[PDB]
Design a protein around this ligand. Structure first.
Ligand code: 07L
Length: 167
């Protein structure tokens, strides 16, 4: 049993809810929240900007030190950093950004990072301002992630379309 509430079960391991991932993280304090990161960990907008704002910019300060030491992530890659006030850990995962021309095949590689964690609160990778089709992102998630993933979908309209089109 875990603390996640109000989710719709899609598969053995994947759950979905219409929720603000920031508000959900603040309520649950999950072991792992996933950030929709870029390779520079520049948390300007979308999920990343909202998560970082909720940490009062402490996520960005920590991320800048990580990049100064390690250099940029790979598209499809990840790193584990603090979850600050939102979670124990934040798994920063880089899905391909269609609005930068990145290979959508890298979305599966991005979701493979989730398998290193038994339970996660996450957004749909490469959705929103990353430009991918969220229906596709949900299909890749279900077909790639084997650990237990609780997906928070920001738009109510999109949530209802993801559920009503799910195979
Ligand atoms: O300001 C916000 C608050 C949460 C949030 C959550 C997801 C997203 O794509 C954008 C967002 O912007």
């Amino acid at each position: 049993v875990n603390s996640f509430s109000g989710y719709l079960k899609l598969t053995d391991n994947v759950y979905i809810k219409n929720a603000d991932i920031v508000e959900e993280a603040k309520k649950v304090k999950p072991t792992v929240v996933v950030n929709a990161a870029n390779v520079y960990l520049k948390h300007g907008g979308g999920v990343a900007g909202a998560l970082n704002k909720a940490t009062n910019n402490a996520m960005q300060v920590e991320s800048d030190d990580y990049i100064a030491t390690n250099g940029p992530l790979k598209v499809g890659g990840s790193c584990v950093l603090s979850g600050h006030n939102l979670a124990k850990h934040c798994l920063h995962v880089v899905g391909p950004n269609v609005n930068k021309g990145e290979d959508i095949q890298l979305l599966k590689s991005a979701y493979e990072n989730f398998n290193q964690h038994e339970v996660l609160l996450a957004p749909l990778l490469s959705a929103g301002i990353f430009g991918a089709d969220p229906i596709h992102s949900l299909r890749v998630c279900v077909d790639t992630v084997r650990t237990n993933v609780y997906l928070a979908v920001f738009d109510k309209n999109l949530y209802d379309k993801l559920v009503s089109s799910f195979l």
